[PDB]
Amino acid sequence: HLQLQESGPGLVKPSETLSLTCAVSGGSSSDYWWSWIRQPPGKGLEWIGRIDSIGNTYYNPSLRSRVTLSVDTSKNQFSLELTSVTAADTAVYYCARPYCAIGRCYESWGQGVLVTVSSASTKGPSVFPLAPSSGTAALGCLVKDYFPEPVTVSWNSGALTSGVHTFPAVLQSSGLYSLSSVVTVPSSSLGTQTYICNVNHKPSNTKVDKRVEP
Amino acid sequence: EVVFTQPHSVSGSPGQTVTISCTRTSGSIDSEYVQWYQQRPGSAPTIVIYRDNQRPSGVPDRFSGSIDSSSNSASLAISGLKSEDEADYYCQSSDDSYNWVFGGGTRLTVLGQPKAAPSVTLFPPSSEELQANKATLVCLISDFYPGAVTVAWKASSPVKAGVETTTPSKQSNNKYAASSYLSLTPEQWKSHRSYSCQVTHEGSTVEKTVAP
């Protein structure tokens, strides 16, 4: 139940160094220990390493020579450096840390950050409104031609969550992704209220607000 | 090295007890704690069992863990199987150096869920997109079961060029979503009188239409 938040570059060139950090909220950053785990798209979990408050580090033997873990509790920074990355290192990277109440502890994980190893350059999305389609009405926004994943989409800065469906992205022959997010709203509302989709593409530091009107 | 192997797939119908085993290939299963993780679509793994057989407060009591020295394996048992139990499960333990090792994962399927027709939404190109000299038809297909569809595009003549379709992807309600996109030039969209998306889900086909 800890709020662990991973952050990193989104896209890394082959042969370069992948650098990630993790911060914890909702608990203390002192004592206990910190772990990294990764999951390539469509594959299983692979442990990377652990560092604890004694200073000791433990590394997956098959990544040992490339991994460095560090932690600074005053900065609230848990760090991973993975050198000489290849395509095999493309994965969601999860931070994990025990959630500890009086008398009980078990591991809690962050939601992960996807890191893609690719030579291609970051491309920011282009967002187009999908005008209302109808007692309900559907409206959405088309997020086109970005790279790498992911894009996240909210509506009315998160105020609107019911009936929201952000579809998995299509990968076009171009190599770029596109996705769509759709919301069902009371057709009664289409003149009384405004609908804006908020698109975030962390790898290009692109954020877009797109008003969807009729 | 030390490996933990799991069955690739376990399945049961609602109400059944199912078990997922986690066999340690080398060294004693009893030597280190065994954890079980559950993973649902689009989310991080969460502990369902830790320290062999302890359960976090919010985890249903239908879940339990055990160790079997003689088969050198650990088991996760799910009694009274429910649809919401459908997910991937991984065991996790440690080797002799205190390194974590994950088992390879098991897909748990809950059988007998009823056929679900896809909901279909077809959007024409926005004026904004067309200002930019581009045009995309967007066909969105959701809430179907089982997870297999085929998309056909119409213009009575079969639009068969510039098609990209996702593969069905499991939503959190165990139904599936997919989408299909048709590219075309501005002139092309104004060219014809109608464009339709036809989703065929086993037997029944669903076709929506849009007009310039």
């Binding site: 206990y32 220990w33 408050s53 004694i54 | 030597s31 280190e32």
Partner: peptide, 19 residues
């Protein structure tokens, strides 16, 4: 009154801070 300084171990001792 003890806080783990490193991962706890099955059937084995581990390091704790007292308090």
């Amino acid at each position: 009154d003890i806080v783990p300084l490193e991962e706890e171990r099955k059937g084995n001792s581990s390091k704790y801070r007292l308090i």
